[PDB]
């Protein structure tokens, strides 16, 4: 029962650190996501740089 308690405590810490890793990937995928960045590159079209996107 003791090694289970040490294994469960280390598993909860590992799940907490894994939670923080995809929390930072959550934020980093927002600041470059073609929605919140508001870059003027969604207007690019397949017909050329002049035509842009309507």
């Amino acid at each position: 029962n003791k090694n289970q308690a040490l294994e469960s405590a280390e598993k909860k810490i590992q799940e907490r650190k894994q939670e923080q890793e995809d929390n930072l990937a959550e934020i980093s995928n927002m600041l470059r996501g073609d929605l919140l960045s508001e870059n003027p590159q969604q207007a690019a079209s397949s017909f050329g740089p002049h035509r842009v996107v309507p």
């Binding site: 959550e26 996501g33 309507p54």
Partner: protein
């Protein structure tokens, strides 16, 4: 083995669906040329719901491109994902509807509906077991409001046992694009109340309010509006695309949300929407997801839920998380806000959870609500209809195209009947 055929009409319907197929392809790992360069086998396991096989590991969407103007097809091909669609599915007219319901439904859309229906039976009957259809259009336009409702009637007389879904974009007065939009909306809700098994009402001004104060964008264009709609479509149908610990597809949502066959007008919403500056100020937890989910400020409709009562509520979730935490939160929102839910339904909120979140997200949720408070959306359109119908404002455009006065009268009559029927079930 549960396929969905996508339909889209009008400029608004095409631009929303162009962003919709972009979001799905990012989730399912499909490049703009149509080949699966993804990572997980869980992506390529249920691709058949939306895409079709093509030779050489190529995936073509099961969508038909419908419009009366050839200018919208140039717009959808100018997008980043414009080459994924099959050119045989592009059915474009020669003369535009011109914000006319009569042209979209009787004289100009009557010759194009046969060409559209040939493509619809072409894609519907290549599926072993089709689940239902999906239509995106706007009720204020001419092509979307007129031919969109015509396609609703003509595919439900051939597929009655299949579910019907329409993502309607109803007009709102405070952001007005066309002047004749109360005429187009009134003539089209009658085709919605009698045919569509479930429908979603999207308000442009609620999308703008979300883009102004919830996401805090300086210059929100239409593609940002279409992204919020498209995330809701993905959240609604994420059950039959990815596994979940307890599932709810389109039909099981329609069973538990629609208590009576004329009560299917919903109130969509998307939970994980935060601004760029508030990204580091939030804790990605289920209580925040649910707290922002039921907020009227986050709602994608212009009718405030506090003015009515929630008949039923759906909750479809995406991500790996706990179930007690979710099940307790829907218990908490029912118990504290007991005045905002109808008494004759004791369990107003249902729950769906999928274990796969969207790409770039760890968690996501979508909100579906059949509330009485959507009757004020129709009541404010009807008061703008009787203001124009009494003096016969723009009616020579419609009367000269082959429809009578009694059609406008019976459209308003069926519309007031729906609002009164909503009022009676709020009284209980």
């Amino acid at each position: 083995m549960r396929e969905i055929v996508h339909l889209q009409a009008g400029q608004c319907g095409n631009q929303i669906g162009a962003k919709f197929w972009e979001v799905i392809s990012d989730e399912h790992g499909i490049d703009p040329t149509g080949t699966y360069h993804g990572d997980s086998d869980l992506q390529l396991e249920r691709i058949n719901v939306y895409y079709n096989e093509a030779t050489g590991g190529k995936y073509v969407p099961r969508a038909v491109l419908v419009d009366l103007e050839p200018g919208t097809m140039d717009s959808v091909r100018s997008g980043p994902f414009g080459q994924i669609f099959r050119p045989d599915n592009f059915v474009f007219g020669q003369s535009g509807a011109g914000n006319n319901w009569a042209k979209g439904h009787y004289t100009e859309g009557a010759e194009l509906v046969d060409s559209v229906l040939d493509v619809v039976r072409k894609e519907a009957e290549s599926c072993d077991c089709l689940q239902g259809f999906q239509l995106t259009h706007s009720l204020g336009g001419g092509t979307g409001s007129g031919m969109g409702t015509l396609l609703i009637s003509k595919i439900r007389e051939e597929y009655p046992d299949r579910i019907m879904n329409t993502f309607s974009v109803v007009p709102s007065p405070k952001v007005s694009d066309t002047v004749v939009e109360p005429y187009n909306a009134t003539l089209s809700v009658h085709q919605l109340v009698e045919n569509t098994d479930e429908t979603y009402c999207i308000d442009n001004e609620a999308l703008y309010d979300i883009c102004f104060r919830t996401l805090k964008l300086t210059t929100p264009t239409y593609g940002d509006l279409n992204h919020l709609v498209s995330a809701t479509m993905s959240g609604v149908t994420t059950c039959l695309r990815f596994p979940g610990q307890l599932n709810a597809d389109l039909r099981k949502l329609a069973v538990n949300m629609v208590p009576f066959p004329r009560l299917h007008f919903f109130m969509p919403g998307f939970a994980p929407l935060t601004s760029r500056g508030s990204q580091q100020y939030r804790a990605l937890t289920v209580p925040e997801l649910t707290q922002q989910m039921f907020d009227a400020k986050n709602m994608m409709a212009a009718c405030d839920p506090r003015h009515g009562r929630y008949l039923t509520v759906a909750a479809v979730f995406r991500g790996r998380m706990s179930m007690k935490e979710v099940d307790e939160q829907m218990l908490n929102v029912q118990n504290k806000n007991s005045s905002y839910f109808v008494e004759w339904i004791p369990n107003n909120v249902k729950t769906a959870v999928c274990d796969i979140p969207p790409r770039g997200l760890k968690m996501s949720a979508t909100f579906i609500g059949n509330s009485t408070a959507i009757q004020e959306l129709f009541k404010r359109i009807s008061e703008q209809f009787t203001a124009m119908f009494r003096r016969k404002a723009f009616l020579h455009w419609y009367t000269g195209e082959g429809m009578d006065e009694m059609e406008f009268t019976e459209a308003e009559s069926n519309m007031n009947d729906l609002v009164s029927e909503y009022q009676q079930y709020q009284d209980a």
